[PDB]
Swiss-Prot record, chains A, B:
May act as a pilot protein, directing MinCD to the polar septation sites or by inhibiting MinCD at the midcell site of division. Required for polar localization of the chromosome during sporulation. Oligomers. Interacts with FtsZ, MinD, MinJ and Spo0J. The association with Spo0J is transient and occurs at a specific point during development. This is Septum site-determining protein DivIVA. Transmembrane segments: none annotated. Disruption phenotype: Misplacement of the septum during cell division, resulting in the formation of small, circular, anucleate minicells. It is found in: Cytoplasm. Changing residue 18 to C: No effect on localization.
Length: 50, 50
């Protein structure tokens, strides 16, 4: 998965499904922390190279 | 977040919510991908430390 795949991700509507705003809030936290690790990995690859 | 935080997260239910199975399956995929990138980042840091 890429951060773009997480961004604004939606799911099928369901009665008594998980609350939409709480799931969308949580996916903003997941997207942020996944992009933090991917950016660090990019940084460390470049240091390896140099 | 840690990968296990993503598995452990709960959400309240709503009249119009998101399908639980679809959310849980997506978060299982993000957890697995996140734990792999964290491992790769940790390996790279060691390759930079060495």
């Amino acid at each position: 998965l890429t951060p773009n795949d997480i961004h604004n991700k939606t799911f099928t509507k369901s009665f008594r499904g998980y609350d939409e705003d709480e799931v969308n809030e949580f996916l903003a936290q997941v997207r942020k922390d996944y992009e933090i690790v991917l950016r660090k990995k990019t940084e460390l690859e470049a240091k390896v190279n140099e």
